[PDB]
Every structure is written in C-alpha cells, then in structure tokens.
Amino acid sequence: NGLTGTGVLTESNKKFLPFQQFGRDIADTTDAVRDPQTLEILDITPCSFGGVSVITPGTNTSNQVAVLYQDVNCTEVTGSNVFQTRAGCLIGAEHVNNSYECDIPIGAGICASYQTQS
C-alpha cells in the first residue's frame, strides 16, 4: 500500500488485534505488515549485510589474500576451503590443528599467518 522497502518476508508467529495495520519496535521502522488482499501477517527482517576484511601477508612477501566476511553465516556468499568461525567466516585460508604465536589477529581466538604454504 505504498510502504516501500527491502527485506525478506516470513510467516509471523506473533499476532495482531484486528484493528491493527502494521507494527514496529523502535526508531519508526516497520517490522510486520498485514497485506491488503490475504490479510496475512508477515515479518520484515532485512536481507543480510556485513563488513568485508582482507588478510594479507604483505605484497613484498607474496600476492595472496584471504577474505573475512564479518558476522555472516556464509551459506550466502573463491571457494578455497571456506571455514566458519565466530568472527565471521574466512575464504581462502587453510584451517590447521597446530598452534603458534599470533601473527595477524582475526578475532575470537583465531589468528592467521603465512607459512610453508598458502
């Protein structure tokens, strides 16, 4: 009905009272809407975003890169052995079982480094 916007729509287990037309929580943005035809109630949560970080060993040493997609479960993003962690997920880095002193801090306990050999 003119309430334009962007997001994904899912079926809402929350309820309305039959005089209510949409909903909101905080800061004027709408969370739920009753559609004009079916009169079904649908949730509006926005389709995922994040930040992108890039891990490099230094161009003087090599020209290779891993990429961190911050705070996103990457079933929704290359292809070189992806690895989901707490700080996002890494693409282009090889998860190992050893342990060393920290070189490049990824976050939440994970570090990254370049050694022999990707």
Binding site: V54, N63, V65, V67
Partner: protein
C-alpha cells in the same frame, strides 16, 4: 555535447595480441559538436585492381574493440608527469 579523442603510437614486438606495459593515451582533440551518438563503423581504403585476373579489396586488416564502463582507476604519476602504473579498484578484493 563534446567529443574527445585520445591516441598513442607504440612500437611492439609481440606476435599478435596486446602487450603488457602501460600506455599514456594523451588527448588529440575535442570537438564542440553536441551530436547524439549511439552506433558506429569504420572506414577502409580499398583500391582498384586493374589488369590482374568487384575490383577492390586491398590488403588484410583487423582491429580490437572494447567498451568502457566506469570504475575508479588510480594513476601513479611520474616525476616527469607521465602516468606509469594504473590501479583498478573493482578488479579483485586485493585491488
């Protein structure tokens, strides 16, 4: 409502295709026209054949065509003034 042409002439030694270096295409002209352009073609200079058994078609020719697009390109200028190394931003994540 302008028309800008940029050019260069470069010696080469590769077999067929494009080389690897950098080319600073400096502008030739700019033409105050205002014409609305959306399709183009290229002119060939064919000569008459004569007493050799239509009567046209000189030589053999080929050219390469590729269309702009906007991005961001960074130029690492020389001390002379010359653009030497060009950086592309949307190429890859490293760029």
């Amino acid at each position: 409502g302008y028309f800008k042409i940029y050019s260069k002439h470069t010696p080469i030694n590769l077999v067929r295709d494009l080389p690897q270096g950098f080319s600073a295409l400096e502008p030739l002209v700019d033409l105050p026209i205002g014409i609305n352009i959306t399709r183009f073609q290229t002119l060939l200079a064919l000569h008459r054949s004569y007493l050799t058994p239509s009567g046209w078609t000189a030589g053999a020719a080929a050219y390469y065509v590729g269309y702009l697009q906007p991005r961001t390109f960074l130029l690492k200028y020389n001390e002379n003034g010359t653009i030497t190394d060009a950086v592309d931003c949307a190429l890859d994540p490293l760029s």
